[PDB]
Design an enzyme around this catalytic site. Structure first.
Site, PDB file in Angstrom:
ATOM      1  N   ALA A   1      44.611  26.433  19.741  1.00 12.13           N
ATOM      2  CA  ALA A   1      45.722  27.201  20.318  1.00 12.13           C
ATOM      3  C   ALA A   1      45.290  28.504  20.949  1.00 12.13           C
ATOM      4  CB  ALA A   1      46.810  27.414  19.281  1.00 12.13           C
ATOM      5  N   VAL A   2      44.311  29.203  20.329  1.00 11.55           N
ATOM      6  CA  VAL A   2      43.716  30.446  20.822  1.00 11.55           C
ATOM      7  C   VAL A   2      43.047  30.184  22.176  1.00 11.55           C
ATOM      8  CG1 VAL A   2      41.849  32.138  20.356  1.00 11.55           C
ATOM      9  CG2 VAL A   2      43.524  31.627  18.573  1.00 11.55           C
TER      10      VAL A   2
ATOM     11  N   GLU B   1      43.024  31.199  14.340  1.00 11.73           N
ATOM     12  CA  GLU B   1      43.963  30.193  14.820  1.00 11.73           C
ATOM     13  C   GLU B   1      45.422  30.591  14.591  1.00 11.73           C
ATOM     14  OE1 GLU B   1      44.600  28.452  17.035  1.00 11.73           O
ATOM     15  OE2 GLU B   1      44.513  26.287  16.723  1.00 11.73           O
TER      16      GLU B   1
ATOM     17  N   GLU C   1      32.396  36.480  51.771  1.00  5.82           N
ATOM     18  CA  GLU C   1      32.881  35.761  50.595  1.00  5.82           C
ATOM     19  C   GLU C   1      34.259  35.119  50.759  1.00  5.82           C
TER      20      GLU C   1
ATOM     21  N   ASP D   1      51.690  43.052  49.021  1.00  4.27           N
ATOM     22  CA  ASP D   1      50.321  42.961  49.493  1.00  4.27           C
ATOM     23  C   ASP D   1      50.211  43.003  51.020  1.00  4.27           C
ATOM     24  OD1 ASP D   1      47.531  42.566  49.657  1.00  4.27           O
ATOM     25  OD2 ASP D   1      47.629  40.442  49.108  1.00  4.27           O
TER      26      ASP D   1
ATOM     27  N   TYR E   1      43.161  49.107  62.728  1.00  9.69           N
ATOM     28  CA  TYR E   1      43.873  49.849  61.677  1.00  9.69           C
ATOM     29  C   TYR E   1      43.345  51.263  61.397  1.00  9.69           C
ATOM     30  CZ  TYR E   1      46.156  45.432  60.156  1.00  9.69           C
ATOM     31  OH  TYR E   1      46.900  44.281  60.082  1.00  9.69           O
TER      32      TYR E   1
ATOM     33  N   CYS F   1      37.169  52.539  50.226  1.00  7.34           N
ATOM     34  CA  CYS F   1      35.729  52.247  50.235  1.00  7.34           C
ATOM     35  C   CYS F   1      35.131  52.363  51.620  1.00  7.34           C
ATOM     36  CB  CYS F   1      35.403  50.898  49.600  1.00  7.34           C
ATOM     37  SG  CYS F   1      33.630  50.522  49.525  1.00  7.34           S
TER      38      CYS F   1
ATOM     39  N   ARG G   1      53.112  35.997  58.361  1.00  6.40           N
ATOM     40  CA  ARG G   1      52.601  36.042  59.721  1.00  6.40           C
ATOM     41  C   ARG G   1      52.014  34.682  60.124  1.00  6.40           C
ATOM     42  NH1 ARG G   1      47.198  35.497  61.089  1.00  6.40           N
ATOM     43  NH2 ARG G   1      46.607  37.082  59.541  1.00  6.40           N
TER      44      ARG G   1
ATOM     45  N   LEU H   1      42.746  49.719  54.156  1.00 15.35           N
ATOM     46  CA  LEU H   1      42.211  48.990  55.301  1.00 15.35           C
ATOM     47  C   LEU H   1      41.917  47.524  54.910  1.00 15.35           C
ATOM     48  CD1 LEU H   1      39.593  51.568  56.742  1.00 15.35           C
ATOM     49  CD2 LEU H   1      41.853  51.028  57.678  1.00 15.35           C
ATOM     50  N   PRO H   2      41.813  46.570  55.869  1.00 19.11           N
ATOM     51  CA  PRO H   2      41.441  45.197  55.485  1.00 19.11           C
ATOM     52  C   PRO H   2      40.043  45.156  54.845  1.00 19.11           C
ATOM     53  CG  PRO H   2      42.312  45.274  57.732  1.00 19.11           C
ATOM     54  CD  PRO H   2      41.989  46.678  57.334  1.00 19.11           C
TER      55      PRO H   2
ATOM     56  N   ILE I   1      33.943  40.074  53.696  1.00 17.55           N
ATOM     57  CA  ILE I   1      34.176  39.252  54.887  1.00 17.55           C
ATOM     58  C   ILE I   1      33.485  37.885  54.725  1.00 17.55           C
ATOM     59  CG2 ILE I   1      33.910  39.082  57.441  1.00 17.55           C
ATOM     60  CD1 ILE I   1      34.180  42.325  57.217  1.00 17.55           C
TER      61      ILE I   1
ATOM     62  N   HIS J   1      35.177  26.011  17.357  1.00 21.76           N
ATOM     63  CA  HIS J   1      34.226  25.854  16.269  1.00 21.76           C
ATOM     64  C   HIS J   1      33.826  24.348  16.270  1.00 21.76           C
ATOM     65  CE1 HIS J   1      37.388  23.556  14.376  1.00 21.76           C
ATOM     66  NE2 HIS J   1      38.199  24.418  14.979  1.00 21.76           N
TER      67      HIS J   1
HETATM   68  N1  LIG Z   1      36.713  48.043  48.652  1.00 20.01           N
HETATM   69  C1  LIG Z   1      36.657  47.062  48.069  1.00 20.01           C
HETATM   70  C2  LIG Z   1      36.651  45.878  47.262  1.00 20.01           C
HETATM   71  C3  LIG Z   1      36.124  44.638  47.643  1.00 20.01           C
HETATM   72  N2  LIG Z   1      35.460  44.322  48.768  1.00 20.01           N
HETATM   73  N3  LIG Z   1      36.394  43.736  46.642  1.00 20.01           N
HETATM   74  C4  LIG Z   1      36.072  42.289  46.669  1.00 20.01           C
HETATM   75  C5  LIG Z   1      34.963  41.866  45.734  1.00 20.01           C
HETATM   76  C6  LIG Z   1      34.994  40.617  45.122  1.00 20.01           C
HETATM   77  C7  LIG Z   1      33.954  40.203  44.296  1.00 20.01           C
HETATM   78  C8  LIG Z   1      32.862  41.025  44.089  1.00 20.01           C
HETATM   79  C9  LIG Z   1      32.816  42.265  44.696  1.00 20.01           C
HETATM   80  C10 LIG Z   1      33.863  42.688  45.505  1.00 20.01           C
HETATM   81  C11 LIG Z   1      37.064  44.393  45.599  1.00 20.01           C
HETATM   82  C12 LIG Z   1      37.528  43.911  44.378  1.00 20.01           C
HETATM   83  C13 LIG Z   1      38.234  44.758  43.540  1.00 20.01           C
HETATM   84  C14 LIG Z   1      38.465  46.076  43.916  1.00 20.01           C
HETATM   85  O1  LIG Z   1      39.236  46.902  43.091  1.00 20.01           O
HETATM   86  C15 LIG Z   1      38.791  47.301  41.826  1.00 20.01           C
HETATM   87  C16 LIG Z   1      37.435  47.309  41.516  1.00 20.01           C
HETATM   88  C17 LIG Z   1      37.013  47.795  40.291  1.00 20.01           C
HETATM   89  C18 LIG Z   1      37.936  48.297  39.375  1.00 20.01           C
HETATM   90  N4  LIG Z   1      37.536  48.923  38.167  1.00 20.01           N
HETATM   91  C19 LIG Z   1      36.290  49.093  37.666  1.00 20.01           C
HETATM   92  O2  LIG Z   1      35.279  48.554  38.109  1.00 20.01           O
HETATM   93  C20 LIG Z   1      36.147  50.020  36.460  1.00 20.01           C
HETATM   94  N5  LIG Z   1      35.328  49.380  35.403  1.00 20.01           N
HETATM   95  C21 LIG Z   1      39.293  48.263  39.685  1.00 20.01           C
HETATM   96  C22 LIG Z   1      39.722  47.759  40.903  1.00 20.01           C
HETATM   97  C23 LIG Z   1      37.981  46.576  45.121  1.00 20.01           C
HETATM   98  C24 LIG Z   1      37.276  45.728  45.977  1.00 20.01           C
HETATM   99  O1  LIG Z   2      49.713  23.759  19.007  1.00 19.70           O
HETATM  100  P1  LIG Z   2      49.061  22.494  18.509  1.00 19.70           P
HETATM  101  O2  LIG Z   2      48.891  21.431  19.559  1.00 19.70           O
HETATM  102  O3  LIG Z   2      49.645  21.995  17.215  1.00 19.70           O
HETATM  103  O4  LIG Z   2      47.546  22.916  18.162  1.00 19.70           O
HETATM  104  C1  LIG Z   2      47.269  23.973  17.244  1.00 19.70           C
HETATM  105  C2  LIG Z   2      46.633  23.333  16.030  1.00 19.70           C
HETATM  106  O5  LIG Z   2      45.328  22.853  16.377  1.00 19.70           O
HETATM  107  C3  LIG Z   2      44.425  23.093  15.287  1.00 19.70           C
HETATM  108  O6  LIG Z   2      43.528  24.130  15.691  1.00 19.70           O
HETATM  109  C4  LIG Z   2      43.605  21.846  14.946  1.00 19.70           C
HETATM  110  O7  LIG Z   2      44.425  20.674  14.915  1.00 19.70           O
HETATM  111  C5  LIG Z   2      45.296  23.577  14.125  1.00 19.70           C
HETATM  112  O8  LIG Z   2      44.579  24.425  13.224  1.00 19.70           O
HETATM  113  C6  LIG Z   2      46.450  24.267  14.839  1.00 19.70           C
HETATM  114  O9  LIG Z   2      47.635  24.284  14.043  1.00 19.70           O
END
Ligand SMILES: N#Cc1c(N)n(Cc2ccccc2)c2ccc(Oc3ccc(NC(=O)CN)cc3)cc12
Ligand SMILES: O=P(O)(O)OC[C@H]1O[C@](O)(CO)[C@@H](O)[C@@H]1O
Ligand SMILES: N#Cc1c(N)n(Cc2ccccc2)c2ccc(Oc3ccc(NC(=O)CN)cc3)cc12
Ligand SMILES: O=P(O)(O)OC[C@H]1O[C@](O)(CO)[C@@H](O)[C@@H]1O
EC number: 2.7.1.105
Lengths: 439, 439
Positions: free
Chosen positions: B383-384, B316, B160, B118, B187, B148, B68, B36-37, B158, B247
């Site tokens: 990079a991480v 890194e 949010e 979707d 629906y 739900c 739509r 449902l929506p 609705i 860091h």
């Molecule tokens: N019915 C309904 C839902 C709803 N209104 N929302 C929007 C929403 C956005 C932000 C905060 C709360 C709800 C959802 C957002 C996600 C959703 O589907 C989920 C929700 C939770 C999970 N998994 C778990 O929580 C397990 N740890 C997996 C999929 C269901 C809803």
């Molecule tokens: O992918 P780039 O732009 O080289 O950046 C990654 C580099 O940046 C640093 O974290 C710092 O210059 C290095 O340790 C690493 O090699």
């Protein structure tokens, strides 16, 4: 400020611990198996424990039937399991309580993280008692129920692992099968399946329905439960074969050098041809071939004339600064490092390199995919192979760095009755020996 | 025989391809949203697509409502969604068919692997039509239903993200909420939930019940479906904050050297103190602190006086042979390598080292755990950080190696209405600049 020291074995940066004059020194889980006999509860218990221990979560199975075989010397019949058997019902309860007593000792006093309580736990009363035990000891409870109504599946389980049970030693296959069917019937009347809809709504559980065809997942609280659920969804009970081998002998092997990315020697190329003939002779309808990203495993796979997939996770253990060196050169240039590794081979990390412990973490996605697949040939490296073999053969972290994985030898793994049958096939091609025993 | 060459960019061993005189040159998935929506289908679609693209599975959302809004210029009311609205019912069907036409083109002609369809897909008729479309095009079908009954959850969704929809531009919050409730009611009569018990027994599906409190999983066929299920079980909708930073400045940063395991400079130590004050001022009830196993991130965490966890996956990017070198020394010693990286920064692998592509694979468990957690502070490396930020900010593989992640700056991530709100907080401590733009 912020003074750190690098631990010699694991190479972990820790705060410099200048202990004063007088130096001073998350919640465990009870996994509850639920279901009628011959529902694969012991199969689930054993496989899950094997996986959890390998990833580094200390896990132990507490099977109530084993406590019973110990308390009651010889097993005669299903009459022991009768609901009207007042004496045996008291004994069975005592056995379950004695197993729980050992669960408490394991989790609270032995450093165990997960206790798998392997019993029928078919009644709400028994489960309420296990929950009380968990709440009073601050243990988490996670339920795994196996539900199956297929008589073919039940009969197959009795034939495969029940008739061969120590309980049926003096019985023939027909007697044991008949007694076991009557034994299952003793549990059917009081069996209350998990009800996540109303009664068991607040319990953390997984219902494995029709040998993993369907799953009901309720209130997964944490990381470990989420991992278990993912694992149960990836494993299967379909028949298959896992072939594990190293790349054919390489140039570094001949020089006694570690790591690197050298190519196959003349003997290594001969093994690769021998492997193709071996693979062909296995007559497998479909076969997945996996290699590392290192040349020697890819050249070995090239000889098969089969599609293959390269995994960076299958690359040999990284020796860091010791890469491309011989063990003699390691002992002479880095004697402290050499001795540290010999003393703690599993946890030892090479400088800017890895430990066997790091290998396990890297290989976990490989294991998960190996579980999903059917016929797979993994062409890898000595340390990688020891790690994978430790998973399949249920070997400890301490034994893992010393498992024998010779060159030019295929390890044929066949999943059967709780374990893995391991067959070794040497492909009659000479190579150097890279195995080094402990000192 | 077995002649291989190492590809210059990715460093992959491939068979030497001596093309002749005349050189000659698995199944995609349709993810079907059901419900449902105001059931979070678009929230699920967007988040799952973001994750799948980041791990390297080309994924696209096809939202029928957007087709739509394009076909029907201005939206007036719920009257458009009435079951007795013959004309709009024809238009809505045409929009769904036009979206499916684009699904076929994406999966069969554009190299797309996953198409997320979707829409409400609330009737068995619509789903049978999608299944027919999948079978005729050799596409797999995986259903994700969100169920739900909580009116608080519906009203919150609705408020949010629905009232702010382009459909309700000329409406006030009360008008839009009232119209949307009537729209949902259109629906409810024809809504046939997924029935894995009888009708939908052979379908591959996940039923997300009560905003992820419970899940019904049926017939998970493959790796990608298993991954989706694991992901959905790890994410949550609880409010939280993710803080990401590098860091504090290290000694290698001052010398313009890459990699290594150098310690904090005097300015880096000042940032670490500044970070502790910042963390304290955030007044977070609970906070998890994660670092890499490299000294500079651990020294930064040490200043916080909070428990922290070291992850080897947060270390890194490994520069292989180029480790501890300046970029000038890389250009002069390895000019071919330097130019190759500049041309293909994401896929380029350092010799005996890594690529940004390898980083993603290593960081996937970090992302999964970040999803499970609430308030988390991740102290890592350039990079991480770019890789993690690309996941949260939905950045492509091409943009990822160039994301700006300055030293002594906290990236505060707040999950809100489909995306992540990103706030940058510079902690007023000087450092060198390690950012290098493309050429
Ligand atoms: N019915 C309904 C839902 C709803 N209104 N929302 C929007 C929403 C956005 C932000 C905060 C709360 C709800 C959802 C957002 C996600 C959703 O589907 C989920 C929700 C939770 C999970 N998994 C778990 O929580 C397990 N740890 C997996 C999929 C269901 C809803
Ligand atoms: O992918 P780039 O732009 O080289 O950046 C990654 C580099 O940046 C640093 O974290 C710092 O210059 C290095 O340790 C690493 O090699
Ligand atoms: N009921 C029942 C079961 C039963 N008799 N066995 C024993 C068995 C051993 C080998 C071959 C077949 C069955 C089982 C072995 C395992 C089992 O539990 C499973 C089975 C399958 C899965 N998952 C999946 O198959 C999803 N890909 C997860 C758990 C259930 C049973
Ligand atoms: O842990 P061990 O016994 O040194 O074995 C791992 C070594 O074996 C080899 O695969 C071959 O000797 C090396 O590349 C690797 O360093």
């Amino acid at each position: 400020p912020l003074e750190l020291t690098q631990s010699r074995v694991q190479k972990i940066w820790v705060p410099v611990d200048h202990r004063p004059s007088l130096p001073r020194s998350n919640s465990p889980t009870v996994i509850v198996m639920v279901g009628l006999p011959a529902r694969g509860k012991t199969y689930i218990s054993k496989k899950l424990t094997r996986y959890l221990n390998w990833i580094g979560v200390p896990t132990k199975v507490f099977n109530v039937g084993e406590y019973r075989r110990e308390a009651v010397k010889q097993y005669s019949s299903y009459n022991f399991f009768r609901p009207d058997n007042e004496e045996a019902m008291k004994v069975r309860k005592q056995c379950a309580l004695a197993a729980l007593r050992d669960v408490k000792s394991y989790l609270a006093k032995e450093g165990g993280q997960i206790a798998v309580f392997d019993a029928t736990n078919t009644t709400r009363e028994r489960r309420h008692m296990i929950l009380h035990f968990a709440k009073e000891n601050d243990f988490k409870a996670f339920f795994i129920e196996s539900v199956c109504d297929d008589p073919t599946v039940v009969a197959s389980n009795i034939m495969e692992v029940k008739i061969s049970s120590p309980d049926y030693k003096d019985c023939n296959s027909a007697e044991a099968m008949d007694d076991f069917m009557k034994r299952i019937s003793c549990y059917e009347a009081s069996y209350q399946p998990l009800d996540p809809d109303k009664c068991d709504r607040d319990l953390s559980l997984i219902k494995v329905i029709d040998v993993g065809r369907r799953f009901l997942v309720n209130r997964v609280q944490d990381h470990i439960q989420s991992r278990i659920v993912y694992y149960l969804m990836n494993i299967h009970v379909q028949p298959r074969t896992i072939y594990l081998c190293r790349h054919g002998e390489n140039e570094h092997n001949l020089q006694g050098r570690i790591g690197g990315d050298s190519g196959l020697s003349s003997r290594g190329k001969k093994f690769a041809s021998a492997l193709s003939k071996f693979v062909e002779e296995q007559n497998l309808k479909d076969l997945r071939v996996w290699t590392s990203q290192l040349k020697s495993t890819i050249q070995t796979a090239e000889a098969l004339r089969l599609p293959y997939e390269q995994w960076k996770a299958l690359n040999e253990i990284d020796a860091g600064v010791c890469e491309e060196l011989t063990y003699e050169e390691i002992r002479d240039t880095y004697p402290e490092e050499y001795a540290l590794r010999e003393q703690d081979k599993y946890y030892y990390r090479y400088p800017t390199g890895e430990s066997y412990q790091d290998l396990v973490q890297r290989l976990e996605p490989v294991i998960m995919e190996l579980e999903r697949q059917e016929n797979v040939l993994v062409i890898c490296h000595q340390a990688v192979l020891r790690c994978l073999l430790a998973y399949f053969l249920d070997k400890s972290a301490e034994e893992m760095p010393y498992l024998k994985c010779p060159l030019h030898t295929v390890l044929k793994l066949t999943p059967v009755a709780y374990g893995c049958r391991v067959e070794s096939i040497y492909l009659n091609v000479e190579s150097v020996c890279t195995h080094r025993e402990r000192s």
